[PDB]
Design a protein around this nucleic acid. Sequence first.
DNA 1: AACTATTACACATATTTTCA
DNA 2: TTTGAAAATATGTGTAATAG
Lengths: 53, 280, 52
Amino acid sequence: RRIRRERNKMAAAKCRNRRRELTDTLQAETDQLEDEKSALQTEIANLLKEKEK
Amino acid sequence: WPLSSQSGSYELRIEVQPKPHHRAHYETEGSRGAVKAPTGGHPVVQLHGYMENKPLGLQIFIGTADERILKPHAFYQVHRITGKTVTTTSYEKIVGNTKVLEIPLEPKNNMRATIDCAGILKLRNADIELRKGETDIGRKNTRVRLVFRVHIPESSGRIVSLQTASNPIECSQRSAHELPMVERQDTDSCLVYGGQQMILTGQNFTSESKVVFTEKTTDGQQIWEMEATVDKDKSQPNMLFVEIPEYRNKHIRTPVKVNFYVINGKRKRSQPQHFTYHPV
Amino acid sequence: RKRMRNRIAASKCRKRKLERIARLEEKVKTLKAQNSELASTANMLREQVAQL
DNA sequence: AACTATTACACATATTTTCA
DNA sequence: TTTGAAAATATGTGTAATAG
């Protein structure tokens, strides 16, 4: 019954990997959205330059 | 403003970049001299195409680096450095939850400005991570870029606003010694087959240095990982000789964008470098 | 023995781990929202320039 | 019972901040 | 000032007790 440790080992590892992958994904998502947001912003500024001839 | 801007319809360019490292200082410390250039001189930025005769205000502030969108860096602030043997440039300090310096741009000098009153302060991580709104952790986050802007008022009363940022800069004493870092790559692309030598020039390259290649989706997911074989037989001091690896799907019909980085141990990796494979 | 100080660290480290995720979600809502609106303002100007 | 997920603890490592 | 590091934190890993 030392296996108990071998498993709880993974048990803990599992949960930990879970909370990481989750947060990494989120970090990914926000980072991308900021990508998208700036693109709009630069566009919008390009149209305002275009507009006011 | 975290609002985007460009090199302009004229042009604000950095004639002399900063040194790759610059151990910044804390509030609990004696201030360090302002950022310098690799030549021992100082960083230099000027405005090309300014056929007018009135001094403007070039402003600088410490921006973010890494592979994100330029944003004022929350864990670092510009610092007005004390003085030089010759009062080089005067300064003006202001805010907006982040400090900003304004050195006058003289026509007399060709709209060129020698930056030598620009130091960098480091804030306690826990101190920042406190304010609500911040989502970035400072741990391991120690890179920066000097951001410079200019607002050109026109005869039409318009304001053509320009901005530029230097090359990344490491501020972490330890990191500057531990983390490797590419500053020049021999090639930016090649075709699917690979098998070509790319000369990578940077700092902190050892014999533990491995070069990894990655493929990621807009989804932010790693799709591919391939290690390249760097000639570790013999080489120069700080520069790796990389043999570009073959791409997974050699049958592509449109150019793919990939990344590669240098790594010396689990937690000692370079920032993501850019590279692209072309179809055949 | 110095363990008294660590129990305090971890507690904070964990607490902070969580707050991070929470703060990220709120930020996604915010961004998705902002971007939607901006996406519109884009189209809006688009037509306009296309009629000038 | 028997097993996995969770949370706090001590100790090992990694980075940051304070001092000399 | 500038440099190098000890001193102080912050975060990862293996356990143990415990809820589910």
